[PDB]
Amino acid sequence: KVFERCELARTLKRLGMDGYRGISLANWMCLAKWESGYNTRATNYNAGDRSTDYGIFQINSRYWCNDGKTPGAVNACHLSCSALLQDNIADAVACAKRVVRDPQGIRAWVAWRNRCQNRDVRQYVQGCGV
């Protein structure tokens, strides 16, 4: 379910990620819509780990969720990968939160520096879905 750019910002704020751990709605919108495009079902196979990711932020089942086939699945969220497979990112966004809860944050991907590098993104969440 890929909606407009100011549509997921309303779902993210209602969840609680707004101003969470320093990652504002625009910080995740700048990378989530770029790595998938507001598509929680954006799943693809991995030629290096042979695993599969599920969620709008490419959440993998190797170190974030336990699916049943990923070897060494530590599942930090402790939830099934079906939560990130649905557009209802209630528990899905909660699993991706653990990815930015570490000391790295949302800068784990190189696209973060090539997209906005945490610049003035307050316009994407200025009266969008608060």
What domains are there in the chain, each with its CATH number?
A: 1-130 (1.10.530.10)
Selecting among 35, 49, 67, 91, the annotated active-site residue is 35
Q: How many residues does the chain have?
A: 130
Residue 4 annotated among the catalytic residues of the structure: no
Task: State the method.
Answer: NMR
Helices (H), the chain: 5-15, 25-35, 82-85, 90-101, 111-115
Selecting among 4, 7, 49, 53, the annotated active-site residue is 53
Rounded CA separation 48/114 (Å): 23
Residue 53 annotated among the catalytic residues of the structure: yes
Rounded CA separation 57/80 (Å): 16
